[PDB]
Amino acid sequence: MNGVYDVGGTDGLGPINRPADEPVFRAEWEKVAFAMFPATFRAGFMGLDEFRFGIEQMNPAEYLESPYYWHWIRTYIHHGVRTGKIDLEELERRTQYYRENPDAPLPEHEQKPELIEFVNQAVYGGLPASREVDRPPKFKEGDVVRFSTASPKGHAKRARYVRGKTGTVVKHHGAYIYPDTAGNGLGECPEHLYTVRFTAQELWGPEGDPNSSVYYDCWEPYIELVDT
Amino acid sequence: TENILRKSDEEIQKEITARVKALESMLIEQGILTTSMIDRMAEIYENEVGPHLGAKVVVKAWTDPEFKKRLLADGTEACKELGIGGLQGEDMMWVENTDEVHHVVVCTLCSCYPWPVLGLPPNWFKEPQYRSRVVREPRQLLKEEFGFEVPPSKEIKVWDSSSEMRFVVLPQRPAGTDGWSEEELATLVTRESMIGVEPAKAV
């Protein structure tokens, strides 16, 4: 989709705010928001590509200025409603309750050890997105290719600043989950993945550094041959 | 930056806190979330996983040419030699800074970061200011934001991490460190030097 989160090349967002030191979690609610991801993933709220698509559908002004982990809360609620797993009216009633009773306890619950075992396995085992497919890669190192001008409204990894641009294939990585399908509830539909190099002048015109390039990852449908 | 429409930070935090506790209570009642699950995730990324792991990889590559070759050929497999890997570093590719090339990593679309070697990203890396600018004027950003002057004749490769490939910068070994131990060398390797926004520490 063409949302404001696609910020590559955007001007006017202001100077970087980089405190000389910062904690991993700035408040207790951030730990909760962070740790909710394995819980909601295991419960079938969403996969990784769908998770990102939920963030992309935020109010753009809220996205630009809200704390990072609030984005995660928005996408949990988005997919909780999508899957019928979160009742909004109940959520709003509970929000008012904890507004008025911030120190009220959380519900009674069992500390199911298998949920912690799940956390440990995911963290140190990973969730690999690589997949085996039937066909060899269509492209190879050194091929000159052009990036698609398609502008889907659903999830994709098609930054506006690379659309229609010509670059050179740097590496073939194998096949991986395809975001244009996975993020839109259409399944993994794995495609071969490449890194493609675009010069700064190709991307930005004459305002481009003559000695800089951007390396961008392209699934196979994103690119078509210009010169072998 | 000033926005006349924006509530105070205190009011924003107060509202977020209630919304998060409310959602937490619902997922707890569904049986899919527990407070012990939350505490475990925080312990891992506060204390167990952080940039000291990537620093170990860098110093091994600096001191073992055969390991450096394996690291550049297959970053995930080489890091697994040291017991390092997992979530959000399933597919690592390490890239070598040289006298002719400087690498810097960004995720313009979605905050991608190699957690197993660096831990969770700092907030500036996730924020729109760095993400918008580094693909467009990396040389100027490095100079103005990080005090890092990359001579104009030197190529800057900006890796925009649009997939599950995770790019990690192998910074050059600082001069004046001949014969240093791996422990001493590690003190020079920062998360910034493995993103590419700074070189490894001088002196």
Q: Please list, in sequence order, all residues whose beta carbon lies within 8 angstroms of the beta carbon of residue B166, skipping any fewer than 6 positions away.
A: B75, B88, B89, B90, B91, B92, B93, B112, B113, B114
Say whether both A121 and A135 belong to one domain. Answer: no
What's the CATH number where A162 sits? 2.30.30.50
Which value, in Å, is the radius of gyration of the alpha carbons in chain B?
19
Domain boundary (A85, A109, A125) is at A125
Closest by CA position to B139, among listed B108, B102, B179: B102
Euclidean distance between CA atoms B167 and B165, whole angstroms: 6
Say whether both A176 and A204 belong to one domain. Answer: yes
Q: Give domain status of residue A17, yes or no.
A: no
* CB distance B161 to B167 below 8 Å: yes
Say whether both A208 and A137 belong to one domain. Answer: yes
**Which residue ranges make up each domain of chain B?**
1-203
Q: Give domain status of residue A11, yes or no.
A: no
> Count of domains in chain A?
2
Q: What is the DSSP code string of B36-78?
A: HHHHHHHHIIIIISSHHHHHHHHHHHHH-HHHHHHHHH-HHHH
Testing the interface with A: which of B35, B38, B115, B190 to mutate, by most A Cβ within 10 A?
B38
Q: What resolution (Å)?
A: 1.6
What's the CATH number where A67 sits? 1.10.472.20
Experiment type: X-ray
- For the purposes of burial, counting CB atoms within 10 Å of the CB of A97, is it exposed (0-12), middle (13-18) or buried (19 or more)? middle
Testing the interface with B: which of A161, A214, A219, A223 to mutate, by most B Cβ within 10 A?
A214
Q: What is the DSSP code string of A36-64?
A: HHHHHHHTTS--HHHHHHHHHTS-HHHHH
B111 is in an annotated binding site: yes
Strand B155-160 with B101-106, pairing: parallel
Q: Give domain status of residue A162, yes or no.
A: yes
Q: Give domain status of residue A180, yes or no.
A: yes
Q: Which of B27, B111, B132 lies nearest to residue A8, judging by beta carbons?
A: B132
Q: Assign residue B14 a region: left if phi > 0, alpha if psi is -120 to 50, beta otherwise?
A: alpha
Q: Give domain status of residue A22, yes or no.
A: no
Is B137 within 8 Å of A123 when comparing Cβ atoms?
Answer: no
- For the purposes of burial, counting CB atoms within 10 Å of the CB of A70, is it exposed (0-12), middle (13-18) or buried (19 or more)? buried
Say whether both A66 and A150 belong to one domain. Answer: no
Strand B155-160 with A212-219, pairing: parallel
Q: What is the DSSP code string of B91-114?
A: TEEEEE--SSEEEEEE-TTT----
Closest by CA position to A165, among listed A80, A95, A223, A82: A223
Say whether both A47 and A81 belong to one domain. Answer: yes
Min Cα–Cα distance to chain A from B164, Å: 7
Place of tokens 């190879």: A140
* CB distance B147 to A173 below 8 Å: no
* CB distance B130 to B159 below 8 Å: no
Q: Give domain status of residue A12, yes or no.
A: no
- The DSSP symbol for B118 reads H
Domain boundary (A64, A95, A125) is at A125
Strand B155-160 with A191-199, pairing: unpaired
Say whether both A202 and A121 belong to one domain. Answer: no
Give the chain A residue whose CA is nearest to the CA of B6.
A65
B79 is in an annotated binding site: no
Q: Give domain status of residue A52, yes or no.
A: yes
Q: How far is CA A132 from the centre of its chain?
A: 22
Euclidean distance between CA atoms A78 and A57, whole angstroms: 9
Q: Which CATH number fits domain B1-203: 3.30.300.30, 3.30.565.10, 1.25.40.10, 3.90.330.10?
A: 3.90.330.10
Maximum C-alpha span of chain A = 66
Contact list, B136 vs chain A (CB under 8 Å):
8-9, 11, 161, 203-204
Q: Tell me how many degrees the CA angle A67-A38-B132 measures, rounded to the nearest 5.
A: 35
Say whether both A177 and A209 belong to one domain. Answer: yes
For residue B181, the one-letter residue type is: S
Say whether both A169 and A214 belong to one domain. Answer: yes
Sign of the torsion angle spanned by Cα atoms A144, B107, A162, B144: negative
Say whether both A219 and A152 belong to one domain. Answer: yes
Q: Give domain status of residue A53, yes or no.
A: yes
Domain boundary (A85, A108, A125) is at A125
- The whole domain housing A76 covers 28-125
Q: Tell me how many degrees the CA angle B172-A197-A193 measures, rounded to the nearest 5.
A: 100
- The DSSP symbol for A107 reads P
Give the active site residues of B.
107, 110-112
